[PDB]
Structures are given as structure tokens and as C-alpha cells.
Amino acid sequence: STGSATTTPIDSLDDAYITPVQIGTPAQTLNLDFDTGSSDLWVFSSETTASEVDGQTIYTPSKSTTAKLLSGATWSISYGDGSSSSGDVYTDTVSVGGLTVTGQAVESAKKVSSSFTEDSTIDGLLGLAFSTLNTVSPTQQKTFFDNAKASLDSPVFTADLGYHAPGTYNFGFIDTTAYTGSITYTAVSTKQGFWEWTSTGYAVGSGTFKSTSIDGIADTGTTLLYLPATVVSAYWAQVSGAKSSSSVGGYVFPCSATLPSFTFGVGSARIVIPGDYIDFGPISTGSSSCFGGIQSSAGIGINIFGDVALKAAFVVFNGATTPTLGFASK
């Protein structure tokens, strides 16, 4: 089997991407944030504290003839950005772009933190990291991909995120028309539960490539590119007037600037992030100070190849017995 679904930016900045997901019978379609940095499929629901729902579409398990309470199961998650959610668990039928999994754990939120409530466009998350990170207790549950894998034509999914435009998540096949050149594959460590890999280096603008190993995670659920402070300083040093602002919480730059590109290495291959992808607009409405899309990972504890990086590539998440990651230009 295969599936193919369009993923759409939530706003004009590409702060996140939403993908429609069918849950239950008859289908209830929710727009979920596909997150290769976590492993829970959780949704706003009829059980969510009413004051914490503001415009989201909810899953109502009582209206699904295929929903079954997973007795005794609870979940609770906290994300790298400080947000969180928790609740109980149903199993139900879940379909993404024509690919159907029966008996998928659908984690129903009883509580969500403010940042989720405040984002009306995201109805929940669909985790695509390794199932070892799944938070369901006392019986850990499998991700949608893990459940689908054996049925797929090939045990892979691909992320093709757009810049200021829709893109695609495919399951079970590589669309060879979706990228240019060849796909370069690179080793993955699953020891922390992430799609963790090592970039071979970077360049700033038309500058020379610096060969250096940069361990990090491919994370569709993180907006920005978080890299070591040395690398980030080298980038922003090429932007007149850019500075790290402790009050804002990162590098800012004059909105009048033209940003240089940023290149990262995948083996001997190179992925070029155009400068415009690195502009996240005014820090507050009407400001002429703009927020940068490349930020320091210092104090996160890990480097994160988030959407800023991934959207410059066609990315293969290869879930073979020994997983790997592939990157192609597009």
C-alpha cells in the first residue's frame, strides 16, 4: 500500500504545516502537525477542557463506531518549546492520504497548554519519530508509520515541505519526479528515539564550505534551524546589523536586509537553503527588526534540522531494519 497527502503551511511564515487525517467511522477529518521529532498521535477532542479549545476541530470518539477506549491508558507529553498536553487513549481507524491503519492509538487530550489553545489551525500532532518515545502508559503504543510499515510497498515516508506553499507527505514510495539529481543517504542513530544524523558541514552564502561534523535531528515539527553557536555566529556575521537579542530570544536582523543562503552537507552532497527561507518577519507587528530562521542550539542540548532546513530538500525517512535518511535537492 501507499498514501499521499498534501501538507499546508498554517500561516504566511511557514510556522508549521498541517496535513488532513481521517479518524474514525464515519471519518472525522482533523488537521494534524506531522512531527518527526515526537511519537504520539494526539488530538483535540470532546474530552478536552472546554476553556482550552478555541477554534480547533475535535475528535469525538463516541461518534465513531470503530473507536474503543484503551482501558487504563494515559499519556502526557512536553515538547522542546515548553508546550504540553495529556489525556487518555482510544484505538480507532486512521487514514492519511489513502493509507489506512486499523487499531491506531489516538491519544485524546483532556488538557493542552496555552500555545496549543492559541493556535486554532492545529488540531493535534501525528508523531513520526521512533515508537520508543511514545508516552502512553502503562503500555507504550506504536506510531502511525510503525503500524503501517509492514503493509507499505517500501518501508519509507518522505517529507517535501514547501516554502510559502503546500507540499507533500508520501508513505510507502519515493516519487522520483519530486526532486532533482540524486538522493544522498546518510546514517541514522535511533538511540535517542529521533531521526538523528550527522551533517558533514556548512557554508554561508557564496563562502567556502567548512567540513565539520554536526550531529542533529531531522524534525518536521520544529520551525527553525538550530545549530551550534559558532555556526550561527558565522552566518549572522554576514548580515549587516544582525545581533543576538537576549530580550527577543535569538538573532534578529534589520528587515531591510538581503539574507545570504546557508548550505549544509549530506555526505558529499550539499543542500542550499535560500536566504529568503531564513526570514521570519517582524519580531512584533510593525517592527523593522526581523526574527532569524537560524538560531543557536546552545542550551537545547541537541541540534535541530527543522523546517527551515528540511523544506529546502526532498527528505526520505527510511524505516528499513537499519534506518537511514535521504536528502535530495528539488
Short mmCIF file of C-alpha atoms in Angstrom, two decimals:
data_model
loop_
_atom_site.label_atom_id
_atom_site.label_comp_id
_atom_site.label_asym_id
_atom_site.label_seq_id
_atom_site.Cartn_x
_atom_site.Cartn_y
_atom_site.Cartn_z
CA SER A 1 0.00 0.00 0.00
CA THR A 2 0.87 3.69 -0.19
CA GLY A 3 -0.50 7.04 0.94
CA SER A 4 -0.02 10.61 -0.27
CA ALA A 5 -1.29 13.74 1.47
CA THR A 6 -0.76 17.43 0.93
CA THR A 7 0.71 19.42 3.79
CA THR A 8 -0.07 23.12 4.04
CA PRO A 9 1.61 25.98 5.93
CA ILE A 10 -0.52 27.31 8.80
CA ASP A 11 0.43 30.92 8.14
CA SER A 12 2.43 33.24 5.90
CA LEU A 13 5.68 32.44 7.73
CA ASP A 14 5.52 28.63 7.44
CA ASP A 15 5.47 28.42 11.24
CA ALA A 16 4.18 24.85 10.93
CA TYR A 17 2.43 22.60 8.42
CA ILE A 18 -0.90 20.82 8.72
CA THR A 19 -1.98 17.62 6.99
CA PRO A 20 -5.54 16.30 6.94
CA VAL A 21 -6.04 12.98 8.73
CA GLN A 22 -9.18 10.84 8.76
CA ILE A 23 -10.03 9.36 12.18
CA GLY A 24 -12.88 7.04 13.00
CA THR A 25 -16.02 5.76 11.29
CA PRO A 26 -17.55 7.75 9.72
CA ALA A 27 -14.37 9.72 9.16
CA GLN A 28 -13.66 12.78 11.27
CA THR A 29 -11.03 14.85 9.46
CA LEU A 30 -8.58 16.71 11.67
CA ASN A 31 -5.62 18.79 10.54
CA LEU A 32 -2.55 17.44 12.29
CA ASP A 33 1.04 18.63 12.61
CA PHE A 34 3.21 15.77 11.34
CA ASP A 35 6.17 15.73 13.70
CA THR A 36 9.27 13.61 13.00
CA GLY A 37 10.58 14.76 16.41
CA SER A 38 7.91 13.03 18.54
CA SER A 39 5.96 9.78 18.62
CA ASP A 40 2.43 10.46 19.89
CA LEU A 41 -0.66 10.90 17.72
CA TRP A 42 -2.80 13.18 19.89
CA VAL A 43 -5.87 15.23 19.12
CA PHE A 44 -8.14 17.89 20.45
CA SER A 45 -11.30 16.05 21.44
CA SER A 46 -14.71 16.12 23.03
CA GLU A 47 -12.82 15.38 26.28
CA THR A 48 -10.61 18.48 26.08
CA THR A 49 -11.23 21.02 28.85
CA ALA A 50 -13.69 23.40 27.19
CA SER A 51 -11.82 26.59 28.12
CA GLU A 52 -8.74 25.17 26.35
CA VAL A 53 -10.48 24.71 22.99
CA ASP A 54 -10.51 27.81 20.74
CA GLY A 55 -11.45 27.07 17.13
CA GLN A 56 -9.87 23.63 16.71
CA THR A 57 -11.70 20.72 15.15
CA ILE A 58 -12.26 18.00 17.73
CA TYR A 59 -12.35 14.23 17.61
CA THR A 60 -15.46 12.80 19.29
CA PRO A 61 -14.85 9.10 19.92
CA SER A 62 -18.46 8.46 20.95
CA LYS A 63 -19.47 9.26 17.34
CA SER A 64 -17.04 6.71 15.89
CA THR A 65 -18.32 3.14 15.58
CA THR A 66 -14.74 1.85 15.44
CA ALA A 67 -13.41 3.74 18.50
CA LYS A 68 -12.52 1.68 21.56
CA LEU A 69 -11.24 3.05 24.85
CA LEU A 70 -7.79 1.65 25.56
CA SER A 71 -8.52 0.73 29.15
CA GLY A 72 -6.25 2.28 31.74
CA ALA A 73 -4.03 4.08 29.25
CA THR A 74 -2.96 7.66 29.75
CA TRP A 75 -0.44 9.94 28.07
CA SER A 76 1.39 13.15 28.86
CA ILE A 77 3.95 14.95 26.76
CA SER A 78 6.14 18.04 26.98
CA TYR A 79 7.78 19.48 23.88
CA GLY A 80 11.09 21.27 23.39
CA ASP A 81 9.29 24.61 23.11
CA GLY A 82 7.76 24.22 26.58
CA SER A 83 4.26 23.28 25.41
CA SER A 84 2.44 20.19 26.70
CA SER A 85 -0.72 18.10 26.61
CA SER A 86 -2.17 14.99 28.27
CA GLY A 87 -5.19 12.70 28.35
CA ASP A 88 -6.48 9.19 27.71
CA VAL A 89 -6.35 6.85 24.71
CA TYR A 90 -8.62 5.26 22.16
CA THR A 91 -7.83 2.91 19.34
CA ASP A 92 -9.50 3.73 16.05
CA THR A 93 -9.07 3.66 12.30
CA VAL A 94 -6.74 6.34 10.99
CA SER A 95 -6.11 7.16 7.34
CA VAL A 96 -3.58 9.53 5.77
CA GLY A 97 -3.82 10.24 2.07
CA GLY A 98 -5.49 6.91 1.31
CA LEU A 99 -3.31 4.76 3.60
CA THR A 100 -5.34 3.17 6.42
CA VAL A 101 -4.24 1.77 9.78
CA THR A 102 -6.75 -0.03 11.95
CA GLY A 103 -6.23 -0.10 15.71
CA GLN A 104 -4.11 3.05 15.80
CA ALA A 105 -3.66 4.63 19.23
CA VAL A 106 -5.40 8.01 19.11
CA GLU A 107 -4.47 9.98 22.19
CA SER A 108 -7.37 12.18 23.26
CA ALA A 109 -6.38 15.41 25.02
CA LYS A 110 -8.06 16.24 28.30
CA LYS A 111 -5.62 19.12 28.82
CA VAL A 112 -3.50 21.21 26.46
CA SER A 113 -1.14 24.10 27.20
CA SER A 114 -1.84 27.67 26.16
CA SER A 115 0.22 27.61 22.97
CA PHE A 116 -1.96 24.82 21.58
CA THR A 117 -5.21 26.55 22.56
CA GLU A 118 -3.98 29.75 20.96
CA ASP A 119 -3.26 28.08 17.63
CA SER A 120 -6.64 27.49 16.02
CA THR A 121 -5.14 25.83 12.93
CA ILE A 122 -3.58 22.77 14.59
CA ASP A 123 -5.98 20.04 15.74
CA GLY A 124 -3.23 17.81 17.14
CA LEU A 125 0.07 16.11 16.31
CA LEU A 126 0.97 12.97 14.41
CA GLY A 127 4.33 11.72 15.62
CA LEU A 128 6.76 10.15 13.17
CA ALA A 129 9.85 9.64 15.35
CA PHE A 130 10.58 6.18 16.75
CA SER A 131 7.95 4.46 18.87
CA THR A 132 10.38 4.22 21.79
CA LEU A 133 9.47 7.88 22.51
CA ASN A 134 5.73 7.24 22.68
CA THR A 135 4.41 8.43 26.06
CA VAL A 136 1.41 6.12 26.54
CA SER A 137 1.43 4.39 29.91
CA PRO A 138 1.40 1.64 31.07
CA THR A 139 1.59 0.12 27.57
CA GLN A 140 3.61 2.12 25.05
CA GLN A 141 1.93 2.50 21.67
CA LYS A 142 3.21 2.48 18.10
CA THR A 143 3.29 5.41 15.68
CA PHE A 144 1.15 5.51 12.58
CA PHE A 145 4.22 4.78 10.45
CA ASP A 146 5.28 1.87 12.64
CA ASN A 147 1.80 0.35 12.36
CA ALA A 148 1.65 0.91 8.58
CA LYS A 149 5.20 -0.17 7.77
CA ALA A 150 4.79 -3.86 7.03
CA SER A 151 1.91 -3.10 4.65
CA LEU A 152 3.76 -0.41 2.73
CA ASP A 153 5.26 -1.10 -0.70
CA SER A 154 8.58 0.15 0.77
CA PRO A 155 9.11 0.93 4.49
CA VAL A 156 9.60 4.66 3.98
CA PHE A 157 7.92 8.01 4.19
CA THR A 158 9.01 11.26 2.56
CA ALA A 159 8.68 14.91 3.54
CA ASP A 160 8.52 17.51 0.77
CA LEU A 161 7.73 20.75 2.57
CA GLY A 162 7.03 23.90 0.58
CA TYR A 163 8.37 27.41 1.03
CA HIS A 164 5.31 29.62 1.40
CA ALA A 165 3.40 26.88 -0.45
CA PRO A 166 1.86 23.45 0.06
CA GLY A 167 3.96 20.28 -0.09
CA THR A 168 3.55 16.55 0.33
CA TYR A 169 3.97 13.66 2.75
CA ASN A 170 4.15 10.29 0.97
CA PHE A 171 4.08 6.89 2.62
CA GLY A 172 5.46 3.73 1.06
CA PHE A 173 7.08 5.08 -2.10
CA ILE A 174 9.63 7.59 -3.42
CA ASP A 175 8.25 9.99 -6.00
CA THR A 176 11.18 10.24 -8.40
CA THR A 177 9.60 13.28 -10.09
CA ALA A 178 9.68 15.30 -6.85
CA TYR A 179 13.41 16.06 -6.67
CA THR A 180 16.39 16.89 -8.86
CA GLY A 181 19.62 14.94 -9.10
CA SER A 182 20.12 12.00 -6.75
CA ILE A 183 19.12 11.25 -3.18
CA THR A 184 22.11 11.04 -0.81
CA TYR A 185 21.56 8.71 2.09
CA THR A 186 23.21 9.10 5.45
CA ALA A 187 23.39 7.05 8.67
CA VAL A 188 20.85 7.41 11.48
CA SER A 189 21.21 6.79 15.19
CA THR A 190 17.95 5.79 16.86
CA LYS A 191 19.50 5.79 20.36
CA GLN A 192 17.59 8.90 21.46
CA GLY A 193 14.42 7.93 19.57
CA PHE A 194 14.95 10.59 16.88
CA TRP A 195 15.94 10.66 13.22
CA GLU A 196 19.44 11.67 14.32
CA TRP A 197 22.19 12.07 11.75
CA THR A 198 25.47 13.89 11.16
CA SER A 199 25.80 16.70 8.66
CA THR A 200 29.22 16.97 7.05
CA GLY A 201 29.44 20.77 7.30
CA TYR A 202 28.18 24.12 6.10
CA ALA A 203 28.72 27.23 4.03
CA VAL A 204 27.38 30.77 4.38
CA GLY A 205 26.32 32.42 1.13
CA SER A 206 28.94 32.02 -1.56
CA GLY A 207 31.59 31.30 1.06
CA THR A 208 33.82 28.27 1.26
CA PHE A 209 32.44 25.05 2.67
CA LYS A 210 33.56 24.19 6.20
CA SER A 211 33.94 20.45 6.71
CA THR A 212 32.80 19.69 10.24
CA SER A 213 30.53 17.05 11.77
CA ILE A 214 27.22 18.42 13.05
CA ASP A 215 25.05 15.85 14.81
CA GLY A 216 21.37 16.75 14.80
CA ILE A 217 17.80 15.60 14.25
CA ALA A 218 15.53 15.86 11.23
CA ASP A 219 12.47 17.41 12.85
CA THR A 220 9.45 18.46 10.80
CA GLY A 221 7.75 19.66 13.99
CA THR A 222 10.32 22.38 14.69
CA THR A 223 10.05 25.60 12.67
CA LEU A 224 13.64 26.81 12.66
CA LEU A 225 17.18 25.56 12.11
CA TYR A 226 19.07 25.26 15.42
CA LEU A 227 22.84 24.84 15.12
CA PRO A 228 25.97 25.33 17.25
CA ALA A 229 26.68 28.89 18.31
CA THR A 230 29.88 29.02 16.25
CA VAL A 231 28.00 28.19 13.03
CA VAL A 232 25.14 30.57 13.79
CA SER A 233 27.51 33.44 14.61
CA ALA A 234 29.31 32.87 11.31
CA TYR A 235 26.00 33.08 9.44
CA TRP A 236 24.69 36.27 11.09
CA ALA A 237 28.07 37.99 10.84
CA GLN A 238 27.31 38.22 7.09
CA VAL A 239 24.15 40.27 7.72
CA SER A 240 24.74 43.96 8.46
CA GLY A 241 23.11 44.98 11.71
CA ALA A 242 22.23 41.44 12.84
CA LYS A 243 22.63 40.73 16.53
CA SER A 244 21.66 38.24 19.18
CA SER A 245 18.99 39.78 21.37
CA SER A 246 18.50 38.28 24.83
CA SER A 247 15.22 40.18 25.20
CA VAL A 248 13.73 38.86 21.96
CA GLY A 249 15.22 35.38 22.43
CA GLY A 250 17.57 35.00 19.49
CA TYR A 251 19.18 36.57 16.47
CA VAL A 252 17.33 39.47 14.90
CA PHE A 253 18.23 41.44 11.82
CA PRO A 254 17.10 44.60 10.01
CA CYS A 255 14.05 43.77 7.93
CA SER A 256 15.69 45.79 5.10
CA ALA A 257 18.48 43.19 4.80
CA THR A 258 19.01 40.73 1.97
CA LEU A 259 19.86 37.42 3.66
CA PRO A 260 22.58 35.08 2.37
CA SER A 261 21.88 31.44 1.70
CA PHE A 262 23.03 28.68 4.05
CA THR A 263 24.34 25.37 2.78
CA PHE A 264 24.51 22.15 4.78
CA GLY A 265 26.31 18.94 3.88
CA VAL A 266 24.82 15.49 3.49
CA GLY A 267 27.79 13.26 2.82
CA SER A 268 29.48 14.77 -0.23
CA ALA A 269 26.17 16.37 -1.28
CA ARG A 270 25.02 19.90 -0.48
CA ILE A 271 21.57 21.31 0.32
CA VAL A 272 21.18 25.06 -0.21
CA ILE A 273 18.70 26.99 1.93
CA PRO A 274 17.90 30.25 0.09
CA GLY A 275 18.25 33.42 2.16
CA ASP A 276 14.53 34.18 1.99
CA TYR A 277 13.78 30.91 3.83
CA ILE A 278 15.65 32.36 6.83
CA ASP A 279 13.37 35.43 7.21
CA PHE A 280 10.68 35.03 9.89
CA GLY A 281 9.45 38.60 9.69
CA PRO A 282 8.94 41.38 12.21
CA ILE A 283 9.52 40.49 15.85
CA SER A 284 6.24 42.27 16.64
CA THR A 285 3.69 43.80 14.32
CA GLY A 286 5.06 46.88 12.57
CA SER A 287 8.63 46.41 13.79
CA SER A 288 11.58 46.85 11.43
CA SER A 289 13.53 44.21 13.39
CA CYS A 290 13.02 40.75 11.89
CA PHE A 291 13.47 37.33 13.50
CA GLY A 292 16.08 34.98 12.12
CA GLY A 293 15.40 31.45 10.94
CA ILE A 294 18.80 30.13 12.00
CA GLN A 295 19.29 30.17 15.76
CA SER A 296 21.70 28.75 18.31
CA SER A 297 21.06 25.29 19.75
CA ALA A 298 23.17 26.14 22.80
CA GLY A 299 21.09 25.16 25.81
CA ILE A 300 18.72 22.95 23.81
CA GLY A 301 21.21 20.13 24.09
CA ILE A 302 20.77 18.99 20.50
CA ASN A 303 21.00 20.48 17.01
CA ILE A 304 17.70 20.56 15.12
CA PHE A 305 17.27 20.48 11.35
CA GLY A 306 13.75 21.90 11.46
CA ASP A 307 11.50 23.13 8.68
CA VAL A 308 13.86 25.93 7.55
CA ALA A 309 16.35 23.22 6.54
CA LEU A 310 14.02 20.40 5.56
CA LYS A 311 11.89 22.50 3.21
CA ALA A 312 14.97 23.10 1.04
CA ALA A 313 15.10 19.34 0.38
CA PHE A 314 13.19 16.25 -0.57
CA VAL A 315 13.70 14.10 2.55
CA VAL A 316 13.44 10.32 2.81
CA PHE A 317 12.78 8.79 6.20
CA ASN A 318 13.84 5.21 5.53
CA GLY A 319 12.40 2.87 8.14
CA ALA A 320 14.18 -0.27 6.99
CA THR A 321 15.62 -2.59 9.64
CA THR A 322 18.58 -0.22 9.80
CA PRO A 323 17.01 3.20 9.32
CA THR A 324 18.66 5.88 7.20
CA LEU A 325 17.84 9.41 5.99
CA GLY A 326 17.98 10.61 2.40
CA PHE A 327 18.23 14.16 1.12
CA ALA A 328 17.85 15.48 -2.41
CA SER A 329 17.70 18.99 -3.84
CA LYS A 330 14.43 19.93 -5.52
#
